């Protein structure tokens, strides 16, 4: 639902790179250039960001049961 903290394969930190990836994508970068700008060199770290779906933003559209 949310970006994993680490790449599953190697363990590089990718949890701090999802918002920066989205900011680079709206800055008209290609996905490959955005991955290269974040330092994700191994393709194991690259498909953590390339293939991620952020379900948490859809989960946040529902009001919490307590408030």
């Amino acid at each position: 639902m949310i970006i994993p903290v680490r790449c599953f394969t190697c363990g590089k930190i990718v949890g701090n790179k999802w918002e920066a990836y989205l900011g680079l994508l709206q800055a008209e970068y290609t996905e490959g250039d955005a991955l290269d700008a974040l330092g994700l060199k191994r393709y194991c770290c690259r498909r953590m960001l390339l293939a991620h779906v952020d379900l948490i933003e859809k989960l946040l559209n529902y009001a919490p049961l307590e408030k």
Partner: peptide, 9 residues
Amino acid sequence: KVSANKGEI
């Protein structure tokens, strides 16, 4: 492999 290295789907 090509997609993950290239940065596309």
